[PDB]
Amino acid sequence: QQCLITNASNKASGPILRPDRPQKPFDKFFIDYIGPLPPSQGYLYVLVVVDGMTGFTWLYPTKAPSTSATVKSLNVLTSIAIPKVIHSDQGAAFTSSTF
DNA sequence: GGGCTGTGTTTGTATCAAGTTACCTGAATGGTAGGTGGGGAAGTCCAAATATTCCTAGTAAGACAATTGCATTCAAGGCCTGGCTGGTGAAACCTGTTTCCTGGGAAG
Ligand SMILES: [Mg+2]
Numbered sequence: 001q002q003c004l005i006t007n008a009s010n011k012a013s014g015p016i017l018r019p020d021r022p023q024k025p026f027d028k029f030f031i032d033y034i035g036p037l038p039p040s041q042g043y044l045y046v047l048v049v050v051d052g053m054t055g056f057t058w059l060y061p062t063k064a065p066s067t068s069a070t071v072k073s074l075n076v077l078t079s080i081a082i083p084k085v086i087h088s089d090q091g092a093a094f095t096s097s098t099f
Numbered sequence: 100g101g102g103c104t105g106t107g108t109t110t111g112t113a114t115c116a117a118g119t120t121a122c123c124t125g126a127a128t129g130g131t132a133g134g135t136g137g138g139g140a141a142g143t144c145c146a147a148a149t150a151t152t153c154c155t156a157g158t159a160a161g162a163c164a165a166t167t168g169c170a171t172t173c174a175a176g177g178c179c180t181g182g183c184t185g186g187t188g189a190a191a192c193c194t195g196t197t198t199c200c201t202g203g204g205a206a207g
């Protein structure tokens with residue numbers, strides 16, 4: 001067990017999966033902060049909410065990727081309509097028990 | 100002559116600290132190798148200190164004049180002291196919450 005946890009596999013994973021598109025908009029949002037960018041107006045982080053139906057991006061810049069900076073960023077966007085599913089990454093701000 | 104407040108002397112216990120230690124880790128030491136910093140010796144040049152006089156300006160002084168400063172008296176106001184009332188500050192009790200509090204940890 002000194003040689004099992006250092007050598008890496010020479011066996012690639014198989015074919016990638018293409019999951020199907022949803023059949024309506026407002027079904028899957030794919031959200032991920034970008035940044036730290038170069039600063040402007042006291043902003044560094046930009047929430048990016050892509051619709052999984054189309055590609056229709058939504059931008060909601062914030063000061064710092066906290067939980068509450070995301071929550072008010074979607075209250076603008078939940079004013080439009082309500083999604084069923086929101087995908088993300090396992091972010092520092094999304095995995096919080098508050099969010 | 101008397102009085103008031105400060106002061107002192109003695110006791111008990113609670114609290115605070117003194118005590119000794121157990122460990123356990125943090126840190127404190129020992130032995131070494133390396134390079135670097137600094138310390139030391141030198142020199143041409145550099146800046147200040149002196150010896151001088153000279154002249155001049157203001158320093159020093161003597162006189163005078165008048166204001167100010169001082170010392171006293173006057174007048175009363177302001178503040179200190181105390182007899183009193185009560186509203187809050189503090190000490191003891193209880194806690195939930197909040198924040199930290201480094202510390203570790205995950206994830207983008
Ligand atoms: Mg990301």
